[PDB]
Structure 1
Amino acid sequence: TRTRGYVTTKDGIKWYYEQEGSGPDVVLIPDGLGECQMFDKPMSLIASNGFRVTTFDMPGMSRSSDAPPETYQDITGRKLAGYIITLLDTLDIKIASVWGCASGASTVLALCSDYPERVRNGMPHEVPTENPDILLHIHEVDPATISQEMAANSRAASGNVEAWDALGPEVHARLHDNYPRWAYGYPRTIPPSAPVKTEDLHKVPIDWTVGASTPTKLFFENIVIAAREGINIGTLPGNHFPYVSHPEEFAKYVVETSRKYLK
């Protein structure tokens, strides 16, 4: 049974979150778009394997939109990690296996580096280290343009346009409003702040991934860093949203990976 709710943390954010299952904690941090409904399908799969899974809309995004502007402006992995930690304390989550793509991945690494005690294992996916030229000036145009552009960009990187489309009108309407907000506070500050320094990656176990169909250059640097640092690195079917494109495989990956760090 899926638990759905809202909670107001001490930092003023009114979080929308979902939980399912019991057992060791698994946390699914969304990507930059901050829409946790993208994890709906995988959520059940994971939970069914003896895990309590928690996900949520990111501050200022979708259902967690009632939050202070600072929580969605000048965003970095560490900033977002700070918020997550507060939320986890509020939900009494002591330690967890954390997944995250893009900014969510930056957050995972930030958590791995600065709050090692709260992380059982980190699963970052496509950590932004550079700013694709397709973005670059995405925070200068009008909201409608950003929305139209980012929707096309996101769908293109979906790894499966059918499944992407099948997220539904509710989700896409929420995504429509998130795009501009994302554009103003993420692309410029997230990449440069990526916690990929040597000292950020060895406090807890890390299992890094990149989209199998993602063009090599986009996250080439992720692979080189992982390899050079001796961190498990691999691919997942799909591109930027494996949890949407290939929910069964995504679930299997998260379950198998987390399972190996449990007693």
Structure 2
Amino acid sequence: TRTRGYVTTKDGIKWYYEQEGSGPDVVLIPDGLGECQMFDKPMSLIASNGFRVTTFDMPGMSRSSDAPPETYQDITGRKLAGYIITLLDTLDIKIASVWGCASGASTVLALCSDYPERVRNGMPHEVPTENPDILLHIHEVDPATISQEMAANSRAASGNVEAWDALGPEVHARLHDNYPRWAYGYPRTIPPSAPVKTEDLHKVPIDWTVGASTPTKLFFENIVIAAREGINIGTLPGNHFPYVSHPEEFAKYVVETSRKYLK
């Protein structure tokens, strides 16, 4: 059944994490906002399909806020990957199918490139390679303004505003405090560190996705890179948060995709 709790890793991070199911491991790395409650619904669906699912709030975000300052500053896919590996080590997860969007996606690719032995298959979604216009000066305004703007930006890219809104007051309160922290340590360093070089994409199977309703330009390069490297590339319903907008379709994708690499 679903377990919820905390675990303090040797890097000082007091992780808030959840787990459900039995069977092969599936890890759901949240996006830049680091809020794992977004995976609640799909998590049950995936878990009921013969997989042990693990999710967690990201370092310094939401319930994983009790972490060293260093763990949420100058963030890169590889930096996050290191933290993830330490967490996986402590939870005794030897190998897993890994899902990730935005910064989570960058982490997935970092895992595939630097820790291929821990990845069964990677499922990156909308890897940031160039920050959009709206995030250029996000850190230059008051924290309250950052939360206001990012709350609007996120809701707009939710893929389903009713579902987004339906995440609940608790989640949205947590997100409120996350916005400024995310702005200060993610957007400027995440994109340039994207592990999308040829050397990063062939160690383990990868199934790449982008939002079906996401404006083409946003993650256009993701599609071209995948196609050029001969990596499976397709779309998922919604935009940036397919696990919130279309939990059923998201769960199905994670299950089928992961299931095909099992042996």
Question: For this structure pair, what is the TM-score category when the shorter chain's length is used for normalisation?
Answer: over 0.9
Report Cα offsets for 1:72-112 as digits up to 9, x if no partner: 00000000000000000000000000000000000000000
2:56 corresponds to which residue?
56
Deviating above 2 A after TM superposition, structure 1's stretches of 4 or more consecutive aligned residues are none
Q: Secondary structure at the match of 1:134?
A: helix
Unaligned segments of structure 2, at least 5 residues: none
**Residues of 1 paired with 2:131 and 2:94: CA distance?**
34
Report Cα offsets for 1:197-222 as digits up to 9, x if no partner: 00000000000000000000000000
**Residues of 1 paired with 2:143 and 2:54: CA distance?**
31
**Residues of 1 paired with 2:199 and 2:134: CA distance?**
31
Q: State how many pairs are aligned.
A: 263
Report Cα offsets for 1:172-218 as digits up to 9, x if no partner: 00000000000000000000000000000000000000000000000
Query: TM-score scaled by structure 2?
Result: 1.00
After TM superposition, give the deviation of residue 131 of structure 1 in Å.
1.1
**Residues of 2 paired with 1:222 and 1:14: CA distance?**
33
Q: Secondary structure at the match of 1:139?
A: helix
After TM superposition, give the deviation of residue 254 of structure 1 in Å.
0.1
Report Cα offsets for 1:48-69 as digits up to 9, x if no partner: 0000000000000000000011
**Residues of 2 paired with 1:2 and 1:230: CA distance?**
37
After TM superposition, give the deviation of residue 139 of structure 1 in Å.
1.0
1:83 corresponds to which residue?
83
After TM superposition, give the deviation of residue 10 of structure 1 in Å.
0.3
2:141 corresponds to which residue?
141
**Residues of 1 paired with 2:86 and 2:52: CA distance?**
18
**Residues of 2 paired with 1:42 and 1:123: CA distance?**
15
**Residues of 1 paired with 2:131 and 2:179: CA distance?**
16
After TM superposition, give the deviation of residue 140 of structure 1 in Å.
1.4
After TM superposition, give the deviation of residue 168 of structure 1 in Å.
0.2
Q: Secondary structure at the match of 2:28?
A: strand
**Residues of 2 paired with 1:30 and 1:139: CA distance?**
21
**Residues of 1 paired with 2:17 and 2:87: CA distance?**
10
Query: TM-score scaled by structure 1?
Result: 1.00
**Residues of 2 paired with 1:176 and 1:153: CA distance?**
13
**Residues of 2 paired with 1:150 and 1:4: CA distance?**
28
| % same residue | 100
Report Cα offsets for 1:3-36 as digits up to 9, x if no partner: 0010000000000000000000000000000000
Q: Secondary structure at the match of 2:140?
A: coil
Most deviating of 222-231 and 132-141: 132-141
After TM superposition, give the deviation of residue 240 of structure 1 in Å.
0.1
**Residues of 1 paired with 2:33 and 2:142: CA distance?**
18
Most deviating of 83-92 and 132-141: 132-141
**Residues of 1 paired with 2:184 and 2:138: CA distance?**
8
After TM superposition, give the deviation of residue 245 of structure 1 in Å.
0.1
Aligned-residue CA RMSD (Å): 0.3
**Residues of 2 paired with 1:63 and 1:3: CA distance?**
15
**Residues of 2 paired with 1:155 and 1:2: CA distance?**
27
Q: Secondary structure at the match of 1:53?
A: strand
**Residues of 1 paired with 2:69 and 2:192: CA distance?**
21
After TM superposition, give the deviation of residue 247 of structure 1 in Å.
0.1
**Residues of 1 paired with 2:120 and 2:86: CA distance?**
17
Unaligned segments of structure 1, at least 5 residues: none
Q: Secondary structure at the match of 1:120?
A: strand
